Amino acid sequence: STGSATTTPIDSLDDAYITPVQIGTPAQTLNLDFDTGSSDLWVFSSETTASEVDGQTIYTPSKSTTAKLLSGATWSISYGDGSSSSGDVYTDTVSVGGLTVTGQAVESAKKVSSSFTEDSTIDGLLGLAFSTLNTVSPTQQKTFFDNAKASLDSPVFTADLGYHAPGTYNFGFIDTTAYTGSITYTAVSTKQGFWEWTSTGYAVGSGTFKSTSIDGIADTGTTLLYLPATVVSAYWAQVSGAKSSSSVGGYVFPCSATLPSFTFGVGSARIVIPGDYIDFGPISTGSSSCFGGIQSSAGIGINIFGDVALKAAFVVFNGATTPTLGFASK
């Protein structure tokens, strides 16, 4: 089997992407944030505290003839941005782009933190990291991809995120029309539950490539590119007026700037992030100070190849017995 679904930016800045997902019988379509940095499929629901729901579409398990309470199971998750959610668990039929999993754990939110409430466009998350990170207790549950894997034509999914435009998540096949040149595959460590890999270095604009190992995670659920302070300082030093602002929370730059590109290495191959991809616009409405799309990972404890990086590539998440990651230009 295969599946193919379009993923769409939630706003004009590509702060996140949403992908329609069919849950239950008859189908209830919710727009979920596909997140290769976590491993829970959770949704706003009829059980979510009413004051914490503000415009989201909810899953109502009582209206699904295939929903079954997973007795005694609860979940609770906290994300790198400080957001969180928790609740109980159903199993139900879940389909993405024509690919159907029966008996998928659908984690129903009883509580969500304010950032979730405040974002009307995201109805929940669909985790695509390794199932070892799944938070369901006392019986850990599998991701949608893990459940689907054995049925797929090939044990892979691909992320093809757009810049200020829709893109695609495919399951079970590689669309050879979706990228240019070849796909370069690179080793993955699953030890922390992530799609963790080591970039071979970087360049800023037209500058020379610096060969240096940068361990980090391919994370579709993180907006920005978080890298070591040394790398980030080298990038922003090429932008007149750019500075790190503790009050704002990162590097900012004059909105009048033209940003240089940023290149990262994948083995001997190179992925170029155009300068425009690194512009996240005014820090507040009407400001001429703009927020940068490359930020320091110092304090996070891990480097994160988020959407800013991933959207510049066609990315293969290869879930074979020994997982790997592939990157192609596009």
Ligand SMILES: C[C@@H](c1nc(N)nc(N(C)C)n1)N1CCCCCC1
């Ligand atoms: C300045 C703001 C911001 N502005 C823009 N334009 N874009 C962003 N991102 C995160 C894309 N973030 N946040 C900075 C981040 C930490 C503290 C909270 C405030």
